[PDB]
Structure 1
Amino acid sequence: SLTKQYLSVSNSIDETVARYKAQFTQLDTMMSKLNNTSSYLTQQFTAMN
């Protein structure tokens, strides 16, 4: 019974880790665009002056 529970918990943990990884990937993709956005605003309005 202990071994069965061990396998179940292992499966659950692996799934949860993969879910977190997918969330992190989505986050990483957007951060690029947002940083480019901040940089462009900086340059633009500094130039307006």
Structure 2
Amino acid sequence: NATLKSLTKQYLSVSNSIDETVARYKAQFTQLDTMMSKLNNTSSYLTQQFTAMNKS
């Protein structure tokens, strides 16, 4: 028997937390994916460095 207004406030508050949580996950997904692509480039450079370090 809580008031509708009170229930609606809680509803919206929890809804906002969900939105903020999902926003966070999307940002983290994007940055981890960026990181993963960047590892492709660094590995390519490091492979070159390894062989150069081994020459002579």
Name the TM tier (shorter chain).
Answer: 0.5 to 0.7
Report the alpha carbon displacement of residue 6 of structure 1 after superposing the two structures with TM. Answer: 0.2
Q: Which has the larger radius of gyration?
A: 2
Q: Percent identity?
A: 100
Report the alpha carbon displacement of residue 9 of structure 1 after superposing the two structures with TM. Answer: 0.4
Per-residue deviation, residues 1-49 of structure 1 (Å, max 9, x unmatched) = 1111001000111011101110111000011122344467779989999
TM-score by length of 2: 0.60
TM-score by length of 1: 0.66
Q: Which runs of 5+ in 2 are unaligned?
A: 1-5
Output the CA distance in 2 between the equivalents of 1:19 and 1:48.
41
- Report which of the two has the higher share of helix: 1
Output the CA distance in 2 between the equivalents of 1:30 and 1:48.
26
How many residues align structurally? 49
**Residue 16 (structure 1) aligned with residue 21 (structure 2):** yes
